[PDB]
Design an enzyme around this catalytic site. Structure first.
Site, PDB file in Angstrom:
ATOM      1  N   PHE A 197      18.501  24.508 -21.279  1.00  0.00           N
ATOM      2  CA  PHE A 197      17.493  25.497 -20.928  1.00  0.00           C
ATOM      3  C   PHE A 197      16.141  24.838 -20.713  1.00  0.00           C
ATOM      4  O   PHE A 197      15.622  24.154 -21.600  1.00  0.00           O
ATOM      5  CB  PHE A 197      17.399  26.571 -22.005  1.00  0.00           C
ATOM      6  CG  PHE A 197      18.585  27.486 -22.041  1.00  0.00           C
ATOM      7  CD1 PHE A 197      19.410  27.610 -20.923  1.00  0.00           C
ATOM      8  CD2 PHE A 197      18.871  28.242 -23.163  1.00  0.00           C
ATOM      9  CE1 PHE A 197      20.518  28.451 -20.941  1.00  0.00           C
ATOM     10  CE2 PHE A 197      19.959  29.086 -23.189  1.00  0.00           C
ATOM     11  CZ  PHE A 197      20.791  29.191 -22.076  1.00  0.00           C
ATOM     12  N   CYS A 199      20.772  35.185 -15.958  1.00  0.00           N
ATOM     13  CA  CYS A 199      20.616  34.240 -14.865  1.00  0.00           C
ATOM     14  C   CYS A 199      21.126  34.779 -13.528  1.00  0.00           C
ATOM     15  O   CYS A 199      20.802  34.200 -12.480  1.00  0.00           O
ATOM     16  CB  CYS A 199      21.312  32.924 -15.224  1.00  0.00           C
ATOM     17  SG  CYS A 199      20.738  32.117 -16.759  1.00  0.00           S
ATOM     18  N   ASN A 243      18.143  24.279 -16.630  1.00  0.00           N
ATOM     19  CA  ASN A 243      18.471  25.642 -16.214  1.00  0.00           C
ATOM     20  C   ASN A 243      17.287  26.554 -16.547  1.00  0.00           C
ATOM     21  O   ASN A 243      17.093  26.952 -17.705  1.00  0.00           O
ATOM     22  CB  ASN A 243      19.743  26.094 -16.912  1.00  0.00           C
ATOM     23  CG  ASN A 243      20.067  27.522 -16.639  1.00  0.00           C
ATOM     24  OD1 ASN A 243      19.452  28.145 -15.776  1.00  0.00           O
ATOM     25  ND2 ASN A 243      20.975  28.085 -17.426  1.00  0.00           N
ATOM     26  N   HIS A 288      23.202  28.414  -8.496  1.00  0.00           N
ATOM     27  CA  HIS A 288      22.559  28.507  -9.803  1.00  0.00           C
ATOM     28  C   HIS A 288      23.129  27.463 -10.746  1.00  0.00           C
ATOM     29  O   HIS A 288      24.339  27.467 -10.996  1.00  0.00           O
ATOM     30  CB  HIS A 288      22.713  29.886 -10.431  1.00  0.00           C
ATOM     31  CG  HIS A 288      22.308  29.917 -11.874  1.00  0.00           C
ATOM     32  ND1 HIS A 288      21.018  29.662 -12.290  1.00  0.00           N
ATOM     33  CD2 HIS A 288      23.023  30.171 -13.000  1.00  0.00           C
ATOM     34  CE1 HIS A 288      20.955  29.760 -13.610  1.00  0.00           C
ATOM     35  NE2 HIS A 288      22.158  30.072 -14.066  1.00  0.00           N
TER      36      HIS A 288
END
Lengths: 392, 392
Positions: free
Chosen positions: A217, A167, A339, A306
């Site tokens: 996710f 990431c 994410n 993020h």
């Protein structure tokens, strides 16, 4: 002495003046939307794990605390019926998963890229560089090559393909686009991230980290055009300016994030100490980044963070002393998309630019001029990108 | 409008003057040396295939036509006994292979890198960028991260890790190193290639391409330091200068080179028409690259040609009209080392600088000033890197 005059004419010819800027942003997601309230029911059913009700309640509490409202996922009920080993823990399923991704990854990248190129408004022949970042779908030739053909780019496009890294790649590939755009006059870089998390789908385990991943996710693809020195004579218009890029591996955190490519797919290991460890370091990282530009009030920046887990956003908010509304854009993408790996920060940057115009702010950065973009990944890698917004 | 003035002080500070140049080259190989005469006996015995004597003859004829004298290989008889599934065709063995590679890839990269750093002569704290290219060993964190910790690089080193892409990576990583070096004053880039071919080792098949690969692929790692504006006040000393980098996907050749990562390891597909296709296109690519520098006699250049197969060197020599000794260094590396993937051209570049010195030539490029480096890979991608030698 005349050969050296040739080299200096080449160097002079390639110089740029302004900084690398983002000229357009486009995003795309799988068609299937999974709402977070239904996911424990769907997930435990389709994995034939309804005989594990205590684990299911544990997953429900993790999903409820996750601050994710919905995700778009490539993995569907049909796909799991056609490849049942994905639901059998540690059973060999890598071939089946890779066959699924090898064509879908460039396919989703194309959809986002078309949007970016459309907004950009220039002809494809002006694209000189393509950088493709993809968590999964490793293949030779890569998704970079496939997308080049799907889009009809010049065969002379300069390609860079970065598979399976984590990431932190949002900030990392952004640095490389910056170096490319600024060192090469005329360079126009198509930067595409496509993270499909299909490799991380496994039957539920009594592992907090694996459960968090299954709750958080999400899938998506983000495409950007990055260039220096916008031409006024055409409809190129900047959205953000990339002023400086930094990367740091946090000492002593090697083991905090590890992931192994195996016959059973992607095998994840994620320490629960990640957010605190990020929170402990974030201010020193921000300070090192923006002090050269005289910024010491952290709330004078706009933020793209993020959204690795909601704990990460809270830790940043807490240890930077941010006002409650500062991470609005980051929390939105985490909420509406989960994410999405490295693509996330660019969904956020897209959201921030749109919300600012929609709310009539005077810049693309929520009315502020300076901002910072953070990516977090293994192990532990933190990306710090200093941005300048553009007026509206 | 005062903050725009802040950005300009940064850019002005980050400008360079000269071109990216290679300041050191270091190479390393696995310890076990396999002679090409003995490999057919070793290969078919250790794979329990002595009961296929016709296939062994077909393999022997390919080996004898290979122009490979010896190779250094990581795959030993001991490793195959500990992991017998590597010898059973299509049996699941990807887990066994990856465990072997994930620690060996950075370890051999370290061996080459230390030599490059030794020649370079500056303190490790001066290395700002690390680019690691590895055909095999996908892992999170990557070999870049391991290598950074093995060497003791700064935690703020800017890292880029490229897994599983092909033999065009030699020229491709060189382009990215050029862009970094030139766009960032002070930048010194550590560029490391380690291609261990363990993932492509399979029981012999009646497939010409797989057999040639089994005859030609060798193991090795090559490391470089690349930077713009060498320091005279210290022992920095340039070997070659990177003038221009171009990349081209040959239209209509998508399928000539394919490789899929599967449970059995790497499944390669390589058309025999590759050398001819390369020979057919080489002059048009070369002319596009060096005409801007007034070059039209191809024998006025020195050559670094990726030694994918001896047929390729012969095709390049034939279709360019090169004198018999023009490709001396490239055939030498193929002879003494086999095809080490992307590391190869840097073994060749290393060989050329050394042979030129040993022969007392007046430049690192066999006495000539301009030269070109060729990498070829999937599918089909060709790298054309124009070089300037340095006086001796």
């Amino acid at each position: 002495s005349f050969s050296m005059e040739k080299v200096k004419r080449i160097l002079d010819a390639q110089r740029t003046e302004g900084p690398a800027t983002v000229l357009a942003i486009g995003t795309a997601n799988p068609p299937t939307c999974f709402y977070e309230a239904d996911y424990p029911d769907f997930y435990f059913r389709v994995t034939n794990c309804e005989d594990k009700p205590e684990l299911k309640e544990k997953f429900k509490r993790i999903s409820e605390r996750s601050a994710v409202k919905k995700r778009y996922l490539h993995v569907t009920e049909e796909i799991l019926k056609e490849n049942p080993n994905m639901c059998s823990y540690r059973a060999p399923s890598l071939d089946a998963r890779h066959a699924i991704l090898v064509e879908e990854v460039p396919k989703l990248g194309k959809e986002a890229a078309l949007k970016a190129i459309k907004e950009w408004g220039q002809p494809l022949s002006k694209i000189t560089h393509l950088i493709f970042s993809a968590m999964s779908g490793v293949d030779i030739p890569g998704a970079d090559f496939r997308l080049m053909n799907l889009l009809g780019l010049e065969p002379s496009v300069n390609r860079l393909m970065i598979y399976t890294q984590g990431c932190y790649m949002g900030g990392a590939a952004m640095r490389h686009a910056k170096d490319i755009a600024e060192n090469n006059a005329g360079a126009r870089v198509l930067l595409v991230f496509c993270d499909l998390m299909d490799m991380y789908f496994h039957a539920p385990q009594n592992r907090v980290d694996l459960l968090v991943g299954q709750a958080v996710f999400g899938d998506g693809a983000a495409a950007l055009i990055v260039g220096a020195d916008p031409d006024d004579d055409c409809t190129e218009r900047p959205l953000f300016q990339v002023v400086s890029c930094a990367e740091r591996a946090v000492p002593g955190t090697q083991d905090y994030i590890k992931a192994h490519l195996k016959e059973m797919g992607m095998e994840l290991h994620l320490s629960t100490d990640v957010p605190r460890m990020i929170g402990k370091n974030i201010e020193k990282l921000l300070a090192d980044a923006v002090s050269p530009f005289g910024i010491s009030d952290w709330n004078s920046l706009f933020y793209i963070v993020h959204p690795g887990a909601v704990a990460i956003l809270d830790q940043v908010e807490e240890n930077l002393g941010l006002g409650e509304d500062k991470l609005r854009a980051s929390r939105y993408v985490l909420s509406e998309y989960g994410n999405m790996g490295a693509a996330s920060v660019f969904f956020i940057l897209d959201e921030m630019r749109n919300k600012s115009a929609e709310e009539g702010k005077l810049t693309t950065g929520e009315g502020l001029e300076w901002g910072v973009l953070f990516s977090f990944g293994p192990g532990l890698t933190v990306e710090t990108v200093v941005l300048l917004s553009v007026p509206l």
